[PDB]
Design a binder for this molecule. Sequence first.
Ligand SMILES: *[C@@H]1O[C@H](CO)[C@@H](O[C@@H]2O[C@H](CO)[C@@H](O)[C@H](O)[C@H]2NC(C)=O)[C@H](O)[C@H]1NC(C)=O
Ligand SMILES: *[C@@H]1O[C@H](CO)[C@@H](O[C@@H]2O[C@H](CO)[C@@H](O)[C@H](O)[C@H]2NC(C)=O)[C@H](O)[C@H]1NC(C)=O
Ligand SMILES: *[C@@H]1O[C@H](CO)[C@@H](O)[C@H](O)[C@H]1NC(C)=O
Ligand SMILES: *[C@@H]1O[C@H](CO)[C@@H](O)[C@H](O)[C@H]1NC(C)=O
Ligand SMILES: *[C@@H]1O[C@H](CO)[C@@H](O)[C@H](O)[C@H]1NC(C)=O
Lengths: 322, 323, 321, 164, 162, 161
Amino acid sequence: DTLCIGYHANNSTDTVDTVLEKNVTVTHSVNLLEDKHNGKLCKLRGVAPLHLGKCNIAGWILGNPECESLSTASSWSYIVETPSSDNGTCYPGDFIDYEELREQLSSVSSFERFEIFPKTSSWPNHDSNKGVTAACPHAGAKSFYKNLIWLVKKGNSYPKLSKSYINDKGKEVLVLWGIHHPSTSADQQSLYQNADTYVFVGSSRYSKKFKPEIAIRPKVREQEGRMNYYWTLVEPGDKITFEATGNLVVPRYAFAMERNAGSGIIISDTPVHDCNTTCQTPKGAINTSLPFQNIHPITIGKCPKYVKSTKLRLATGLRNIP
Amino acid sequence: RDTLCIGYHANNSTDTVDTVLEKNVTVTHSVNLLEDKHNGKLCKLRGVAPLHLGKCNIAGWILGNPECESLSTASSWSYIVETPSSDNGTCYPGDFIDYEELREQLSSVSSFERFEIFPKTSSWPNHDSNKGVTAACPHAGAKSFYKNLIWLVKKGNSYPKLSKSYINDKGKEVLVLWGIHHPSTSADQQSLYQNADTYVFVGSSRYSKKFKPEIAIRPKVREQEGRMNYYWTLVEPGDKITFEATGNLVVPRYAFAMERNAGSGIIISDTPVHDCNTTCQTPKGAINTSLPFQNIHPITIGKCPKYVKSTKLRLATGLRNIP
Amino acid sequence: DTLCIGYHANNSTDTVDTVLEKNVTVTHSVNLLEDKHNGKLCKLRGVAPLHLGKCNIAGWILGNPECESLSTASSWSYIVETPSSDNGTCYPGDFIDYEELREQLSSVSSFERFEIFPKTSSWPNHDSNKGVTAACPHAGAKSFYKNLIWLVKKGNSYPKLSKSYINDKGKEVLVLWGIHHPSTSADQQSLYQNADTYVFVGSSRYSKKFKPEIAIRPKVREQEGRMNYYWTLVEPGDKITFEATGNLVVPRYAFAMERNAGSGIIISDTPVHDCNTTCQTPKGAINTSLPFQNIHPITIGKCPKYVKSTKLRLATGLRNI
Amino acid sequence: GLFGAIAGFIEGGWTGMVDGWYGYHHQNEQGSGYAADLKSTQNAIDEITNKVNSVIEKMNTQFTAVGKEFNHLEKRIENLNKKVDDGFLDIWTYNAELLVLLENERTLDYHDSNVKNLYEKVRSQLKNNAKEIGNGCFEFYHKCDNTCMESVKNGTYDYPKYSE
Amino acid sequence: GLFGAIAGFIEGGWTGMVDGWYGYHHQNEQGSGYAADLKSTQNAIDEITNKVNSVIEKMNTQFTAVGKEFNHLEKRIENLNKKVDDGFLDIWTYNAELLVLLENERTLDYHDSNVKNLYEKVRSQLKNNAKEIGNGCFEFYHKCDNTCMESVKNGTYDYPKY
Amino acid sequence: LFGAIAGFIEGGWTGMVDGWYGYHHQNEQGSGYAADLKSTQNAIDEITNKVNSVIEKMNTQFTAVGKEFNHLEKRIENLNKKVDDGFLDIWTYNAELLVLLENERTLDYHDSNVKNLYEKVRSQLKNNAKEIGNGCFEFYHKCDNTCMESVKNGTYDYPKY
Ligand SMILES: *[C@@H]1O[C@H](CO)[C@@H](O[C@@H]2O[C@H](CO)[C@@H](O)[C@H](O)[C@H]2NC(C)=O)[C@H](O)[C@H]1NC(C)=O
Ligand SMILES: *[C@@H]1O[C@H](CO)[C@@H](O[C@@H]2O[C@H](CO)[C@@H](O)[C@H](O)[C@H]2NC(C)=O)[C@H](O)[C@H]1NC(C)=O
Ligand SMILES: *[C@@H]1O[C@H](CO)[C@@H](O)[C@H](O)[C@H]1NC(C)=O
Ligand SMILES: *[C@@H]1O[C@H](CO)[C@@H](O)[C@H](O)[C@H]1NC(C)=O
Ligand SMILES: *[C@@H]1O[C@H](CO)[C@@H](O)[C@H](O)[C@H]1NC(C)=O
């Protein structure tokens, strides 16, 4: 009559490593490493991302004729560009503080686009129709950004213009405008009669005078001239003033905007879907409670720490014998 | 019948601690590794006390805003304290260039003496150094201006090209500040400095920049449709700085012989400043501790404990407690 | 007849610390802390570093007359300056985005220097010989940067110049140029007749117009005038255009260049040698498998984590009796 | 292992015992069979579960968007960003890797301890009434029926029964 | 717990023994009483103290001023700074939290070990001269006076006994 | 922790130089030390693995720490300094504590191995020898050399006396 004392065993093949021994077979185990994503770009808090698809931020805000898709959503958790989305600033130029702008726009609480300077009523002494170019084609036809207007002289006359907007929204207004630098002093007077011109923009915090730099730059999209793009946020109750004797690409549409920090921008081909996620990567979303993931270093949301590990198998049972 | 037992201590202790295997385990003795206690005061850091601007901010303090008149009696400070509601700085609307950089450079100073780089009486003989006041910088109802700068205006329909140079004869760096004035209208321009097309030039061995007044109507700020941008530079010992203008130059009056020691910052807080020592300072108050971790505040100045999100880090020293 | 069970012991004096006890003598132990360097600047990947010795990056790329001996090299893993190498921009001025340039140049894959605008054939209407100064002396004689040419007027005439280069290499081309700011309006017309001048540089991505700022700056190396240095990378197939009515210090030599990120610059007196290393510090290279080193915080390569520890002795044996 | 029980003086485990981690195998006149130690097994499950949960639950992260954009003239701050990212990568990888190695070592020893303790419990219960085979097995000197095996598992084993 | 002594075969602790962590409770004709094991208790105190001191003393920090200022057009580097701050916060919080959990587990087992060892020491000292009750208690077969209990604590116990 | 090393076995044997744990026999054929081949090799393997794990798990990136900033970038310079000192404090602390922790465990690991080697033989010769109490066994039955073998090999398979 005997009584023995022993321990469990099974068909398990799970191995784990210890400080003293490698490849130790155990009866039970859990994985602390999340290595599984749903290969989709999903919605963040509860809101979906802004997908530009074909265009990039530059093209989207300026209103490139190709980014004419939709009356865009009023809010987004983050932004998605594709690695091959090229249509942005069609007219060659320099977008000032572009990266900063992209960051500021990465995630928005409310976002409504309005006509800051109505085309019909705003510019009575200047031509607001001739301002199109072959550098911004929309179906064969020469066209231009939708949110800006390329003001040219009205029959051999370009009077000093002076327009002001006063932020009567309840939120910040994002105002964009351009400065045009002709290639030749002939093109200069052809467009804005006056030879020596200037543009001035000013608010309570912003103030800068612009002098057109006239010269022949190497051809880009057929243009030897250039066009630099500027932007600023007008505080509620504040007012912004435009003043130019030429070369000013005036604002038409601006953006009443309320932003919430803490997001970014994903460049990926990964399809956007209607699903929830607490953590997003360029390769797809991550649904997990685990502390570590080896899916991607660049992450958006409340995510697991990125690790180089391939397997983090944690032993819960005991050594396995037959 | 005779006997002898072997056992362990126990007491009235209620201290609980967590282990990897078990939570809320009552123990006989324990210590707390987490410092969660501050003295709610802004104290001295190394030996030295902090520079308190109180009502004003760095901008106002260095430019010499008429309101920040009560303060610069310290020749050194461990760090700087602004209040969340201290609004007096650049009273005349404008742009302070590399302001954040300046604030950093000034955060902690070893020696700091303010001197009159360009004496008001003897320096500008061909320009008016008295009319340069504005309603944007009021000191007791009266129109006034920054104390450390002088707004040079024309002397009766005449503004001759000026050219003044200072040569750093101190033993340390000199912080030189100056302004460029951008009138709102070309009329205001000639009203102040007769000449219509003007320029200002500042240059040393390392610094060099020419300034062109941008004349235009900016939206009214503190009654001003014009603007005034503020610039600064550190002149190395033995080096010299040259000012040259045909107008629009707000010249330096006072500069700062200065020796700086890196490694400090700036606290924006209402927390009262006191006469006490501390090795670690937070916006909420100082921290006296040997513990490795604190959950009082993330932003810290000095040799401090690592900030942690933990609420309690109770470390067991005794053993399980039984009755 | 007895049988006992015991454990090893020896003459070892090695001590180690535990959570419960300090200075515990142990039979055997290993050190996890690497505290040993070879006091030499060695090759990093397989490639040696670019040593400027006497000169700094500024002087080296501009072609300071003193940095005449140096870059027999078409590639380097990292760059070495000496703490006392002073020879750079001899003519007082401002090197724009200098730090950025130094970073971009820190490590290059291929690097060949060519004559972008040949001195003899490029400038027919301007003087390309008088452009020397006492601020850039080479053996008593007044001289100037080798990679730039200080174009001055050709006998009371400085015609608007316009030269373009088109990147026909297979790689990026680093183009450098300078803008000269005379001290006096007299010096201005003395050098470039015209009083009101301008220079313009432009490619597909770069575009900037330069206006000479004429004034008397405090004397530096005898110069009350200044000279600012600019640079840009011209993409393959792209072209860059120079245009000036004066004050333009034109490019002579440029650099066909292919760069590989991930390196830096060491300022040290430590001698450079012919040896391999996987980890480099300003004090010397580090050959080790250990996880931690206390030799230097600033490191280049695949290195051990820098620690403040003095000793990290790990016990392998047992207590010693 | 560390306690000499598991893979020690108890060489192997029982695939037969499927209802628990630690248990007994009785052998008397009423037959044979395995049976896990209810209380002993549940305790380990609770504590091991808590362990796993502690390693996971203590990792409370912020809502952050890693990844920044820099232009061709910001390579330095781009590399600074790259440094902080790779800095965290090395830190977390090492800690996570070592945390697993450490906790696994302890867990296996934790089970070794539980088996050793279960043996000690029984052995110090039937002093003379049974002799140690040495294989974690006890051979009864006094006949032991099923309701007797119960008084051993429940730890409620009467003594007064010494025979021969 | 891990060694089966504390809260194991020795179910509870003695509030009566206030002079040490581990000790004895004798019971003979000269009376009763508790008494901590001087040497055994002091050793734990030394080692446990060292432990606490190691966890603290190894944290040697730099003199740094966390906190930077950025203007409205430096939001990116501001967020970079924020990232490095929250990065350290998560790292330290997790490690500190886990360090406590781990070290507490070990410490409790450390005491369990010390009690188990103190029992083993005595038991292997008086083999036959006393029988194990099973409650960490030994019942003497040979009368044991006070100066006898001493030879057990001092570990200097003889065996002439029946 | 296990009461063996520096416990009921007060000291170690400088005489035993061929292993970490071993025996010292004493019979009519003489005396001598002899390490436990299998027991010693096992510790060496595991301890080696330990040291190797602490080292091998540290897989680093190819990075060039150190950045250059001009006089007007002091802020980002200090940001860089912060991230450098941040890593310094983190690694120093962890490395320091890792050593303290692993050393504690290693010493206990050896204590365990000695205690286990004793338990192994004790539970092998029950009556045939009595415990001196110093990790020593005194044989009741004469034990020759080929007998000492059946104790080391753990093949003391015939309790005759
Ligand atoms: C929008 O993006 C495309 C792609 O980059 C631009 O480039 C060319 O557009 C023409 C006209 O349809 C196509 O024939 C080419 O295939 C496009 N290029 C390439 C390389 O794909 C296009 O010009 C852009 N249109 C606008 C108005 O911006
Ligand atoms: C310093 O701060 C005060 C307070 O903001 C400024 O005073 C304001 O001026 C307006 C204009 O009439 C008053 O109506 C407000 O009531 C004032 N605020 C307060 C709290 O009184 C003052 O102008 C500043 N002085 C300088 C030179 O900075
Ligand atoms: C087992 O361990 C060794 C040592 O780490 C390793 O080389 C191998 O990958 C493992 N074997 C298998 C079959 O996975
Ligand atoms: C526990 O209980 C009493 C009542 O509060 C108290 O006086 C005493 O200090 C406590 N015992 C100890 C040792 O702290
Ligand atoms: C014991 O520690 C002290 C203090 O750290 C140290 O200076 C001394 O060298 C140590 N003793 C020995 C012999 O290593």
